[PDB]
Design an enzyme around this catalytic site. Structure first.
Site, mmCIF file in Angstrom:
data_model
loop_
_atom_site.group_PDB
_atom_site.id
_atom_site.type_symbol
_atom_site.label_atom_id
_atom_site.label_comp_id
_atom_site.label_asym_id
_atom_site.label_seq_id
_atom_site.Cartn_x
_atom_site.Cartn_y
_atom_site.Cartn_z
ATOM 1 C CG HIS A 41 -0.345 0.236 2.521
ATOM 2 N ND1 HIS A 41 0.037 1.490 2.949
ATOM 3 C CD2 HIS A 41 -0.078 -0.610 3.543
ATOM 4 C CE1 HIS A 41 0.535 1.400 4.169
ATOM 5 N NE2 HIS A 41 0.477 0.137 4.553
ATOM 6 N N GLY A 143 3.715 5.823 9.368
ATOM 7 C CA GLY A 143 5.039 5.561 8.846
ATOM 8 C C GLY A 143 5.734 4.356 9.440
ATOM 9 C CB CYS A 145 3.484 0.425 7.038
ATOM 10 S SG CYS A 145 1.812 0.624 7.688
#
Ligand SMILES: *C(=N)[C@H](C[C@@H]1CCNC1=O)NC(=O)[C@H](CC(C)C)NC(=O)c1ccc(-c2ccc(OC)cc2)cc1Cl
Ligand SMILES: *C(=N)[C@H](C[C@@H]1CCNC1=O)NC(=O)[C@H](CC(C)C)NC(=O)c1ccc(-c2ccc(OC)cc2)cc1Cl
Lengths: 305, 305
Positions: A41, A143, A145
């Site tokens: 993503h 942030g 991820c």
């Protein structure tokens, strides 16, 4: 007390954390050999996150749209591919700090360390457990991820988790290193219900076993019980049904402490019903279920790497 | 909950851990530049630990009596010296993995990460706090001496702790990296009493502040109070007296959460008297005091290295 939640030394994993930027979105990547793994993503804009079509958004993106940064150096992407929910970026340099690693899918109850990362630089490390509803109760901000969960034995690093999202109940959901989500979760901005969570019973028993060597013995009693009767009272208090397999894992612990597994089950049974009465085990006023048997053995014997 | 006890990434510190053997005794060492630091009671036999005369036992030992192992390689000791309670071994090779470091002495209340080590190889990492009685509540076994406590900011590593012994109450005592013990403790096998411990108040207030952003707000009330009246009820419950300095550190946290420091003190006051009534803050059923204000800010904003 003498017993703490301690994570694996994060040295090996820090050598693989990179920055991955696609458009205006940036997250962490895992640089192993000549491939970098990151949540898919990253190709999503804020509007796209409400309902993406990843195969349609990916084809619009190209190699030069993926910028990988390993600290202050640049990596050149020479190929990209979508494996389920992770993005695979092929780079021209093999990570000199790639350790002996392995991609594993862990089972509910199992624990692992999490190296929380932001912009490809490590922020902190902590211990985590795969809840039976396939969520984890982590500490993640925007942030984060791309941060990975890992175990280490002797010299090998088993990457088992990659962070993806936060659920409405504040818990977290992610995938293995092959993109397959843990649980019935998808990567889009929608209300996603995690199932009814439970308490990893074999983990609580290993924790009470750890308390015995460390001094706390007040919860011990003289009642004993049977495996069935324990499970009957474990169902009512939202605990996993203990199996003969579970007892076998608690085996070597009962041989060291000299107290049989079924005796220990009776003490937890009474702790479940009678409550805690304000006392504390190992400094905690609740029953901890994020310590596996192997975790308890590892800390009470000092296995190193 | 969204808030966890997380330690600094231990990557830099793992590159400095070595093995130090003297006679039959072996412990961990810290290899910085061309010097290796280790607890001085490595020159002690099991009989000597009851009442050593370190200056007399040291002179009998020589350079070749100190064997330093950096993994599978050997270090050659070209000089030794006793600085208070740490042993300084001068080697012929400068550690290639020496980071930008600094030797600091922390104050009670301050937190730090601990890399638990055995035989010079890292075993695990966890967060710890210097208790007001100058002990720490760690997780240490035999052979853990030589493990160090450290903080990291941006790029620098501040070594503040080196492990030495365990007290009769199960807590732990050590020195700074200059050999000066934290507290009134000496390195010999005798019953040593740590003082009456207390609860770091400014830390509990920062933890309740962290709970506000993370969802838990039931302990919040509408009563307010004054700095004195809080201290009067803090003395009775064995808490540190809050000072105007303490309030100033909790300042930026109160500006983000929008609730004044004195309002927060009243909520803890009632939590102190009324108890918890079985509820939980951030998953814990006790009041945590091992989170400094700076720790809470670091995790709720994501400072990396
Ligand atoms: C990765 N960098 C980032 C980390 C998140 C964000 C903050 N804390 C975390 O763990 N990941 C995301 O932002 C992902 C992106 C998806 C496309 C996978 N999304 C979410 O984490 C997310 C998804 C859904 C909701 C949500 C909550 C409640 C709702 O109704 C009540 C509806 C949707 C929230 C979030 Cl943060
Ligand atoms: C270092 N490798 C080792 C680590 C200890 C041991 C296990 N857990 C730890 O933290 N350090 C030591 O063994 C040191 C050596 C000294 C010479 C500094 N000693 C102790 O840790 C120690 C000292 C005194 C006692 C003790 C306890 C109770 C008494 O009466 C009730 C008397 C003495 C115990 C210990 Cl383990």
């Amino acid at each position: 007390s003498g017993f703490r939640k301690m994570a694996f030394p994060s040295g090996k994993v820090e050598g693989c954390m990179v920055q991955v930027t696609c458009g205006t979105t940036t997250l962490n990547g895992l640089w192993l050999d000549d491939v970098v793994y990151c949540p898919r993503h990253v190709i999503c804009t804020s509007e796209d996150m409400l309902n993406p079509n990843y195969e349609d958004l990916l084809i619009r993106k190209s190699n030069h749209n993926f910028l990988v940064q390993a600290g202050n150096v640049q990596l050149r992407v020479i190929g990209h591919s979508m494996q389920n929910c992770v993005l695979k970026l092929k780079v021209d340099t093999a990570n000199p700090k790639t350790p002996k690693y392995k991609f594993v899918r862990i089972q509910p109850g199992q624990t692992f360390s999490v190296l929380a990362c932001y912009n490809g630089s490590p922020s902190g490390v902590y211990q985590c457990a795969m809840r039976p509803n396939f969520t984890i109760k982590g500490s993640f901000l925007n942030g984060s991820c791309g941060s990975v969960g890992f175990n280490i034995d002797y010299d090998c690093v088993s990457f088992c988790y990659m962070h993806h999202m936060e659920l409405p109940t504040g818990v977290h959901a992610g995938t293995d290193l092959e993109g397959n989500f843990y649980g019935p979760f998808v990567d889009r901005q929608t209300a996603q219900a995690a199932g009814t969570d439970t308490t990893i019973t074999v983990n609580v028993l290993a924790w009470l076993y750890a308390a015995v060597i460390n001094g706390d013995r007040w919860f011990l009693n003289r009642f004993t019980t049977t495996l069935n009767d324990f499970n009957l009272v474990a169902m009512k208090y939202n605990y996993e049904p203990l199996t003969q397999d579970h007892v076998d894992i608690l085996g070597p612990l009962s041989a060291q402490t000299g107290i049989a597994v079924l005796d220990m089950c009776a003490s937890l049974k009474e702790l479940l019903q009678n409550g805690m009465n304000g006392r504390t085990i190992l400094g905690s006023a609740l029953l901890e279920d994020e310590f596996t048997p192997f975790d308890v053995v590892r800390q009470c014997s000092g296995v190193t790497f």
